[PDB]
Amino acid sequence: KVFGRCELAAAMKRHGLDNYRGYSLGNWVCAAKFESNFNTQATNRNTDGSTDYGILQINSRWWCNDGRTPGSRNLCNIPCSALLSSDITASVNCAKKIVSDGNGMNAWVAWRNRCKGTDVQAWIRGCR
Numbered sequence: 001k002v003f004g005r006c007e008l009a010a011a012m013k014r015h016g017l018d019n020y021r022g023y024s025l026g027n028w029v030c031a032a033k034f035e036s037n038f039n040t041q042a043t044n045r046n047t048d049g050s051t052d053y054g055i056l057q058i059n060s061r062w063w064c065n066d067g068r069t070p071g072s073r074n075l076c077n078i079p080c081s082a083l084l085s086s087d088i089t090a091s092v093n094c095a096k097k098i099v100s101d102g103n104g105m106n107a108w109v110a111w112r113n114r115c116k117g118t119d120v121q122a123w124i125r126g127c128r
């Protein structure tokens with residue numbers, strides 16, 4: 001599913017991401033925008049043999065199991081395909097673990113390069 005911007009904001013807010021680990025809702029929306037363009041089905045392969053999955057491009061070397069990634073830790077204890085669901089619950093629960101692990105949202109490369117330091121609140125403009 002391709003979420004609308006405010007639709008995703010509302011889902012993320014309901015799931016407790018607004019200010020989770022001190023990151024305002026716009027940070028999370030901005031991260032999803034540039035990681036997946038709001039597409040829950042997005043997948044992308046990386047050079048180390050891992051793949052990124054879903055709305056928040058969660059990586060299979062660390063967080064989920066896809067059965068084909070060398071050195072995979074599966075720290076969210078979930079199959080990577082669960083992170084492609086139209087329901088963002090699993091991705092949110094896993095993202096909460098990721099952002100709590102020491103480097104905050106720097107875990108998301110697109111967030112660091114395209115969101116960090118910017119007017120991220122603009123990503124929730126007009127949303128109710």
Ligand SMILES: CC(=O)N[C@H]1[C@H](O[C@H]2[C@H](O)[C@@H](O)CN[C@@H]2CO)O[C@H](CO)[C@@H](O[C@@H]2O[C@H](CO)[C@@H](O)[C@H](O)[C@H]2NC(C)=O)[C@@H]1O
Pocket residue numbers: 035046052056057058059060062063098101102103107108109110
């Ligand atoms: C969301 C996520 O899974 N983040 C990973 C991060 O994934 C990137 C990947 O690096 C890119 O090549 C493609 N897109 C993904 C999402 O933007 O990868 C990081 C390492 O490259 C990883 O950070 C490591 O996390 C573990 C567990 O928290 C730590 O123990 C390490 O210290 C982290 N290593 C570094 C260098 O920060 C993200 O979790």
